[PDB]
Design a protein around this nucleic acid. Structure first.
Lengths: 87, 403
RNA sequence: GGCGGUGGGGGAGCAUCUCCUGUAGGGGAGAUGUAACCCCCUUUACCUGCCGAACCCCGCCAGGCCCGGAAGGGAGCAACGGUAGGCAGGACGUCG
């Protein structure tokens, strides 16, 4: 699957792509942040620093692809939880 | 009525862009553009022509020739479809002074007695004082559905529930309500279900007035038959006749009805929509289609179709043209990509520009960050490529200058 | 001449939130808020014309852009059409 930064951007809005609720919604999501998370979770992700979400077609926001066959919604919740707690 | 606008826009729809028309894809629309029409009970014979004038037009002399591809056929259909529903003659005159005289008629089972009231509340807003005169017999309910109306408004009316007649119960109100009458509508249409009789009662009362307009209140529902009524009317009214077709919500057939009245030269000046005086706008073709085809109406093609002529008038229009201007450069790239700034650099400049505002193209200094980044984002390019256009421009302009 | 432009209801739609969903674009279901489209009721609060805020106002979205192997779908700028809001006339209402 693909994970677009916009899913979990506390700043962006729902229509602008968010999928996790306010709680879990990291401020300024980075691919690093993302990549890293899925690693702790036993996944093997790859970054594409130069892809764009149609919804913000004008901005290279990149995404990270993982091969996972489970709910995306809760992976997403899964990734945000890991990110709020970060030393 | 609405299903026409329904089943119809489903063909303009078909025209997307994906696989640009070979020269037949047009046909796959026609056969159905037309069946929307037939099914919308339009006089077949009218439809089959309609279908031909798209052939001999848009798979012949066609070519993006004009506002590009799909846009065109989606334009030809329109410009023609309209002419079907009526050329143009909605100009319902008013009152050269302070006194006119409109005559209302129309077979029984129409909206003639109501269309009376309605028209009164049309001119009201047009800016005139209309009075009504029940110049015929009415049913003991018709009085419970008219006066009330004339009360919904200020419109005074002369009705006869006591003793009655016609050519005098019409004279008095005439020589009576004048103490404020700017316009005078006369509800005289006897209760006839048949036109001939309609046109006889109507004359006895055209000798007692010098009408400015005679109006026929036909009926959508009546479908295409509405037009065989239009003829006997025009063929009897010295061109002072004008149709009013109502009940454009109570029937599948009806849009097929105007086309009938539209064949007859007789002009359509008003139309029905509902029952409340509100939804009762004057008839103007182009508009009706805007409501019809939905989407982006008529005026939606007077900048990208007006700036494009034979190119030997435009290509040379700018030959004397020297002074610069952003729409003027757009006008130059529009002769460099064509009629032979690398290719890709010619389309992108034309792309960026094609996303600025008249205000911005006209004398373009007002452009800065916030705007740059909107043209540069609405067009698909980078803030840097819009600055290159500005540059280029601001250079060709300094350069272009004297004689 | 002056001065004035009314309250609302219904649903589409849109904005923001919440929930589920599809190994991209996406898709379903709701809450709240609404001017914009449709229709009704009330009112003098309506007409005809030109303007309207570039974009953080609506529709419509050409091109161009994005995701996609495609099919197709997204975001959306001009233009165009509208809101809020203005300049005229005109008519309705008032003269407190």
């Amino acid at each position: 699957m693909i994970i677009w930064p916009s899913y979990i951007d506390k700043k962006k809005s729902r229509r602008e792509g968010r999928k996790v609720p306010e709680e879990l919604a990291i401020e300024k999501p980075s691919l690093k942040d993302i990549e890293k998370a899925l690693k702790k979770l036993g996944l093997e992700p790859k970054i594409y620093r130069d892809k764009r979400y149609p919804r913000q077609h004008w901005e290279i926001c990149g995404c990270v692809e993982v091969d996972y066959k489970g709910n995306k919604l809760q992976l997403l919740k899964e990734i945000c939880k890991i990110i709020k707690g970060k030393n | 009525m609405d299903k026409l606008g329904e089943n119809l826009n489903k063909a303009l729809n078909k025209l997307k862009a994906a696989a640009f028309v070979d020269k037949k894809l047009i046909k796959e629309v026609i056969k159905d553009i037309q069946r929307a029409l037939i099914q919308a009970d339009v006089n077949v014979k009218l439809v089959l022509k309609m279908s031909k004038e798209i052939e001999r037009r848009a798979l012949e002399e066609k070519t993006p020739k004009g506002l590009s591809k799909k846009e065109h056929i989606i334009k030809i259909v329109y410009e023609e479809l309209v002419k079907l529903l009526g050329e143009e003659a909605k100009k319902l005159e008013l009152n050269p002074k302070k006194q006119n005289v409109i005559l209302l008629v129309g077979i029984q089972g129409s909206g003639k007695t109501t269309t009376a009231a309605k028209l009164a509340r049309y001119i009201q807003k047009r800016g005139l004082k209309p009075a009504l005169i029940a110049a015929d017999t009415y049913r003991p309910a018709a009085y419970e559905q008219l006066k009330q109306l004339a009360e919904k408004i200020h419109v005074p009316i002369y009705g006869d529930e006591t003793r009655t007649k016609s050519p005098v119960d019409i004279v008095k109100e005439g020589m009576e309500k004048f103490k404020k009458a700017d316009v005078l509508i006369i509800d005289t249409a006897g209760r006839h279900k048949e036109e001939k009789g309609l046109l006889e009662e109507m004359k006895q009362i055209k000798e007692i007035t010098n009408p400015d307009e005679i109006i026929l209140v036909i009926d959508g529902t009546i479908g295409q038959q509405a037009g065989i009524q239009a003829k006997a009317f025009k063929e009897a009214v010295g061109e002072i006749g004008s149709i009013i077709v109502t009940k454009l919500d109570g029937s599948a057939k009806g849009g097929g009805a105007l086309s009938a009245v539209a064949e007859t030269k007789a002009p359509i000046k008003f139309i029905g929509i509902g029952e409340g005086i509100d939804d009762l706008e004057p008839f103007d073709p182009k508009k009706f289609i805007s409501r019809l085809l939905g989407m982006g109406d008529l005026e939606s093609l007077l900048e990208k179709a007006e700036d494009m002529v034979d190119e030997k008038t435009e290509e040379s229009i700018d030959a004397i043209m020297r002074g610069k201007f952003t729409l003027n450069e757009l006008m130059t790239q529009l002769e460099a990509i064509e009629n032979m700034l690398t290719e890709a650099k010619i389309k992108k400049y034309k792309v960026i520009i094609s996303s600025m505002t008249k205000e911005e193209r006209e004398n373009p200094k007002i452009i800065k960050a916030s705007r740059i980044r909107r043209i540069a984002r609405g067009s698909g390019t980078t803030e840097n490529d819009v600055r290159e256009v500005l540059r280029y421009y601001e250079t060709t302009k300094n350069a272009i200058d004297k004689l």
